[PDB]
Amino acid sequence: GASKLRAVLEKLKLSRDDISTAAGMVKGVVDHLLLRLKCDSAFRGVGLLNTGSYYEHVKISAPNEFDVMFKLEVPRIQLEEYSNTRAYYFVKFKENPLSQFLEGEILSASKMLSKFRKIIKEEINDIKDTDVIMKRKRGGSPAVTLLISEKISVDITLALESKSSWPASTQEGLRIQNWLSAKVRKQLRLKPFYLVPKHAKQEETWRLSFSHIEKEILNNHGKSKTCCENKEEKCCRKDCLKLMKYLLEQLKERFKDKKHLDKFSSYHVKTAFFHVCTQNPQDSQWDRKDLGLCFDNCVTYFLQCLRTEKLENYFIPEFNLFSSNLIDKRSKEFLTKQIEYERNNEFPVFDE
Ligand SMILES: [Zn+2]
Numbered sequence: 001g002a003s004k005l006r007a008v009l010e011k012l013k014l015s016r017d018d019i020s021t022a023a024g025m026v027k028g029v030v031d032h033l034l035l036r037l038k039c040d041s042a043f044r045g046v047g048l049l050n051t052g053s054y055y056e057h058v059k060i061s062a063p064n065e066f067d068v069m070f071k072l073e074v075p076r077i078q079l080e081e082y083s084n085t086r087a088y089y090f091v092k093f094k095e096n097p098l099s100q101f102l103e104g105e106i107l108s109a110s111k112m113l114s115k116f117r118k119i120i121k122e123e124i125n126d127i128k129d130t131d132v133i134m135k136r137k138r139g140g141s142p143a144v145t146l147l148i149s150e151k152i153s154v155d156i157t158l159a160l161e162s163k164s165s166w167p168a169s170t171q172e173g174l175r176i177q178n179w180l181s182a183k184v185r186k187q188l189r190l191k192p193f194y195l196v197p198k199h200a201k202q203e204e205t206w207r208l209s210f211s212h213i214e215k216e217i218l219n220n221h222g223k224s225k226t227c228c229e230n231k232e233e234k235c236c237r238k239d240c241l242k243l244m245k246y247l248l249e250q251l252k253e254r255f256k257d258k259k260h261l262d263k264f265s266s267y268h269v270k271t272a273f274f275h276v277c278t279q280n281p282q283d284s285q286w287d288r289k290d291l292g293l294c295f296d297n298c299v300t301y302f303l304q305c306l307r308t309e310k311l312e313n314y315f316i317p318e319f320n321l322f323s324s325n326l327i328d329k330r331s332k333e334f335l336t337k338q339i340e341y342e343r344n345n346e347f348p349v350f351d352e
Pocket of ligand 1: 228237
């Protein structure tokens with residue numbers, strides 16, 4: 001019930017101070033690293049892009065794991081879609097500071113990746129108890145991992161910043177008109193977009209990223225401009241997204257040996273949550289006193305995506321995150337059985 005869920009949220013608060021304290025450490029090493037690249041290197045126009053769970057105020061676990069994005073302003077970019085993927089692109093340019101990594105017209109992800117990796121190893125040795133370590137490449141993003149005081153892992157993604165208007169594959173995405181309004185949609189789509197190096201599954205492809213927009217929505221999320229700015233307009237949208245993330249995290253924990261749920265990530269949960277916000281656009285559909293109902297809305301929609309094997313990227317609707325090419329049918333059916341069981345029994349995974 002809604003009291004069991006409120007107890008989970010209270011338990012998650014006990015971890016607030018360790019996450020924020022660790023975020024202070026990350027920021028200290030990141031600003032130091034950033035000012036070496038910024039001063040003099042092949043990545044001079046670099047800048048910090050403050051995105052990810054922590055900056056969205058929905059990081060509720062893993063105080064030793066942070067994702068950080070560096071952005072790189074580039075001269076005007078021309079894109080070329082990789083086959084019919086809708087999310088993966090080759091980068092071209094319409095005498096620029098990236099000429100080093102070009103191969104003909106195409107900007108080489110793996111070459112730029114490789115210099116970035118080396119340039120940071122070189123500047124890291126000069127930084128107090130911080131090292132570079134290699135996790136699974138995952139297509140090139142995260143591009144490099146830092147280990148701060150040999151305790152905190154910081155995954156750092158290099159992202160190109162394009163101030164051009166969004167690619168065609170986003171035209172029907174970001175369907176926030178009935179929720180956040182058409183005015184907000186136009187305003188958000190005048191913002192830049194980002195490209196992160198990412199194998200599409202041998203190629204030099206990049207994938208669109210809209211983390212800065214996901215942060216904007218999450219921190220300005222009501223139909224009312226004053227949603228969550230006073231006690232009469234405290235909604236439970238964020239509490240539901242935190243509970244969805246914690247649900248998945250706790251389920252993955254119960255399979256740490258075989259790791260059957262390894263392919264599922266909080267990005268999947270976050271994408272499904274944005275679709276529910278679109279489907280339930282009124283702030284009264286997220287009254288704090290209806291927490292148990294809104295959480296059920298989030299869980300059944302997430303079950304529906306697993307059963308239909310369809311979870312469309314919130315910005316690129318033809319990019320299906322749950323297609324069998326990415327997540328096999330068997331993993332989705334296994335996660336469906338667990339979540340179904342938990343939903344029908346008032347979430348015994350949350351019992352103390
Ligand atoms: Zn709110």
